[PDB]
Design a protein around this ligand. Structure first.
Ligand code: NA
Ligand code: NA
Ligand code: NA
Lengths: 468, 474
């Protein structure tokens, strides 16, 4: 009965790792992970934003089914559906020691008794940030302007209980917790770790070591003001790209610390490791005041975080399982976050519930070097109103064809991705019969999603996002 | 109960799609621009200079006439076979200097008419240039690659279809930057008179298609993808279905431009004209970034120093571009100015610097920058005005922007305010103040509508029998 470790990076772009082609950043640990496992070049997140993507991946269900369509606003009634089951829920029922450390972002806050929390979601141990980003209260509530100091996480909960201000930056705070929990394991029970790193989401916080690696990529202003709090960046000169790269290398190091602990404890050959990201990056294209001075890369792919174009949804993914998988295999088979649930059911020898719809397919055939026969197209969504450039709402991927649907059920884009990698040759009005086939397939999938039985069972309905 | 019953020479060097962040002297952390960095070191560098528009043709029309480009009949792109061109009665800096007795010449990108064959439209000669080697198009074509039968196609781009004094040329034996710089150098050699000169050197770099010699590609080998290294001369017409090339080819093209600017500047100095030549180096609009919107925009890497938007956009990154002026030792050397200035300012600035008078029969939008160069404060009597008429875009573009002090308002294509920013507190345009600043909103929208009416009812436009024509072509 194999252990499972799912390592989730935050806003990590498709081109943000050396093994995915980044020409500057040093990511030795994740690069080695890819060499020892299977790396996917055509893997997608279920959504181009944190909350629906994470909900999708943990449930095996298109996020709209689970009640999460985009951001989760403070004080409102948006959370993961009460009757939803996560990988953790199912593995607990198989007799697993379950734990999560880091970003949760599946409810409106840790103090909400009317909403599922980490334990309800199947994690028997948790060090959790319920929010979408790291806060340091000592920087937020500081009186002077400008504010100087590196960001140290406040407001996290260990097993539902308040914690002191961290004495490590977020990545180390997460990884030390993971290593400690593994150090203090009671028995020989199989474990499931969900290591949800907050890197590379704003606010970036990196130790000097990683910062020094990219001093060429810092602006003169950054060098004069390296500790400048991001809350004070709106009216300041550009910082360059080095702080972003530093943060990537810091993440890499903390991933390495988790992987080194698995190997040291004698569990390499018994542990399934999945490394992925929840959505495409924040690039140089900042849309919000909390998005400044970042430098995510998409390997040329169109769009970024928020967007249903490739660079918003295509993300790194690597799977390793001791010596049981082909080492250093690279797969270009189209796969996505919703596939993990059936994959792990098969790999870990548990049955999926049959009282609910799952959207994904087992990837075991891909790992076994066989064809993947996919019955359904890949389906993506985001419900993000009030954007300066209006977002689209749905995307469907079927073979080489990809259709993007606007916030009014109208096809806005149609691409053949094999002849148009960068989504610059819109085929709407040019391919009438492919248009009708793809639109028909969209309506059938949308209808199935909107009429989801499990969502009906909890007295819920698809609710359009009306909030910001 | 209620119900009871010796005149100075002029060289204007215009780069194409060169971004605000694209030069080392503007903070680029990778690219080597020794010649342009030196120009800034020897001159006045503006950090808050704007092009008149976020697209080639209206920007260039604006700069050359001192008039907001819509007044001149150019609102965005110039398609072939249509009637979009610089208005017939418009005068450029070249027309004015021709009448002062200048030897006037133009080399490189024109992009102010629908083609060199169009006898119904003003050409380079009509615009006041007595000598020209011109590309009338918005981009370089190499017919040999365009017409090649094999797919994919391999070969570096050599300019075809350029006109020397109205006449066809053979395919260039040098890539565009060198084709231009060589023409400039030869013209400066072959001239006989001691008449003052005006050179408009309109480089095609860094516009797609990129074309750079091996020397410059080698400078950036680290920044080339594995695929690029295996397929270095792959033709850009065949990039749509191929792996990313990395960012090295873009940097190479920047350094190539820099060397060609250097060649021209070296010639000015070598012929003994450094002390008596005004040199303006600028760009026509913001860059094409990693944010590709079109099949001809792939594998590019323009930088905006973090500023919002890019080419096409009215946000800072689409209109703020590099600008350097040098005039021998007549100007403060190594000066850096953060006074907001723009392309429409050049006409009255040069009128003062070069001692000619502006025509009194037409509206001009800019103001003389002589006070800035004399290290005094500049007071504007008009807002800075920008526009672009670009329909059918995937993310709809906005149409106007006005700038007054630290305040910037962007107007959508339905004539409605969409954004209001204080650039002093919000460099990155992320804090929209629409519905948060009632007095400022009223002041700025009022200033806009006044400026819009004045532009729409331009007298010179009326004099040639024209009107503002909304862009309905693609
Ligand atoms: Na995220
Ligand atoms: Na955009
Ligand atoms: Na241009």
């Amino acid at each position: 009965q194999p252990n499972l470790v799912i390592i989730m990076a935050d806003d990590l772009g498709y081109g943000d790792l050396a093994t995915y082609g980044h020409q500057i950043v040093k990511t030795p640990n994740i690069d080695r992970l890819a060499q020892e496992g299977v790396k996917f070049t055509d893997y997608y997140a279920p959504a181009p934003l944190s909350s629906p993507s994470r909900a999708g991946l943990l449930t095996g269900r298109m996020p709209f089914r689970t009640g999460i369509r985009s951001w989760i606003p403070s004080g409102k009634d948006v959370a993961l559906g009460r009757n939803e089951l996560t990988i953790a829920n199912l593995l607990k029922a198989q007799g697993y020691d379950t734990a999560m450390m880091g970003k949760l972002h599946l409810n409106a806050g840790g103090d909400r008794t009317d909403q599922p929390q980490a334990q309800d979601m199947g994690f028997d141990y948790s060090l959790a940030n319920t929010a979408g980003f790291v806060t340091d209260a000592t920087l937020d509530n500081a009186k002077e302007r400008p504010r100087y100091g590196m960001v140290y996480p406040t407001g996290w909960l260990r097993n539902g209980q308040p914690t002191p201000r961290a004495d490590k930056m977020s990545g180390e705070y997460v990884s030390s917790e993971v290593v400690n929990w593994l150090d203090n394991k009671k028995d020989s029970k199989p474990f499931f770790l969900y290591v949800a790193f907050t890197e590379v989401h704003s606010p970036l916080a990196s130790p000097k070591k990683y910062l020094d690696m990219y001093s060429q990529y810092m602006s003169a202003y950054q060098k004069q003001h390296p500790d400048l709090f991001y809350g004070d960046w709106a009216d300041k000169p550009w910082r360059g790209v080095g702080e972003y790269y530093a943060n990537i290398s810091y993440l890499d190091a903390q991933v390495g610390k988790v992987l080194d602990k698995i190997k040291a404890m004698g569990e390499e050959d018994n542990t399934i490791v999945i490394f992925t990201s929840d959505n495409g990056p924040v690039t140089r294209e900042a849309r919000k005041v909390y998005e400044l001075n970042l430098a995510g890369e998409t390997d040329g792919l169109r769009g970024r975080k928020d967007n249903l174009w490739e660079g918003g949804i295509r993300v790194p993914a690597i799977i390793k399982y001791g010596k049981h998988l082909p080492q250093g295999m690279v797969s270009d088979t189209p796969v996505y976050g919703l596939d993990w649930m059936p994959t792990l059911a098969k790999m870990m020898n548990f049955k999926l519930p049959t009282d609910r719809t799952f959207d994904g397919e087992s990837l075991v055939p891909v790992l076994e070097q066989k064809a993947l026969k996919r019955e359904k197209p890949l389906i993506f969504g985001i419900d993000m109103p009030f954007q300066d450039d209006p977002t689209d709402e749905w995307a469907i991927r079927d073979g080489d064809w990809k259709m993007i649907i606007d916030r009014n059920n109208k096809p806005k884009y149609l691409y053949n991705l094999k002849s148009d990698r960068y989504e610059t040759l819109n085929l709407i009005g040019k391919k009438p019969d492919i248009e009708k086939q793809m639109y028909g397939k969209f309506l059938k999938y949308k209808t199935d999603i909107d009429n989801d039985s499990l969502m009906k069972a909890r007295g819920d309905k698809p609710e359009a996002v009306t909030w910001g």
